[PDB]
Amino acid sequence: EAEAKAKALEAQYRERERAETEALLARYRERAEAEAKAVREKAMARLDEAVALVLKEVLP
């Protein structure tokens, strides 16, 4: 009885941690994708004047 209840709680908590890992997993995929968008959006609004800065350093 004791070893049966042991492996029953073992399998149930396997599957519980599997759901935990998959939930935080998909959360952090969406998190990294949203942050990649959140930075490459910020890329565009300061492009040409920074290029003028580097062009003024390179051609001094």
């Binding site: 935080l24 997993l25 959360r27 952090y28 998190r31 990294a32 994708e33 942050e35 990649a36 930075v39 490459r40 910020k42 890329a43 300061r46 492009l47 040409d48 920074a50 290029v51 800065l53 580097v54 062009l55 350093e57 390179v58 051609l59 001094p60």
Partner: protein, 124 residues
């Protein structure tokens, strides 16, 4: 998960800097047919002289052989025309065994790490 988040952040950081470097490269490679480049070439030409005193020869793009003729005879040096050296000049000094090179592409490849730290500061 936090380490993958940091990987995505540094990846985005690097590709925005790749965008910046690429558009600087395109502005550089679009310079020599816009109405400034015979004012561009003289500065780096005389500075290729002054970075190696005692030159004998210069060689650069033959599209502005006039601006390398009548503004470098006072520089007192051979001028020989060989293309394939885009945006600049190179100076062969004395005894034929030294060659200072000078190009805006070369200056970008020498200055881009320092300007990358500076652009990342003034950009983020």
């Amino acid at each position: 998960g936090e380490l993958l988040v940091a990987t995505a952040r540094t990846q985005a950081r690097g590709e925005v800097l790749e965008e910046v470097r690429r558009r600087v490269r395109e502005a550089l490679e679009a310079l020599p047919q816009k109405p400034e480049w015979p004012e561009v070439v003289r500065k780096l030409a005389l500075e290729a002289l002054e970075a190696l005193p005692g030159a004998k020869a210069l060689v650069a793009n033959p599209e502005d052989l006039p601006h390398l003729e009548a503004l470098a005879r006072e520089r007192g040096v051979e001028l020989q025309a060989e293309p394939a050296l885009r945006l600049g000049v190179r100076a062969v000094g004395a005894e034929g065994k030294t060659q200072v090179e000078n190009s805006l592409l070369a200056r970008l490849d020498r200055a881009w790490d320092a300007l990358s730290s500076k652009v990342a500061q003034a950009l983020w």
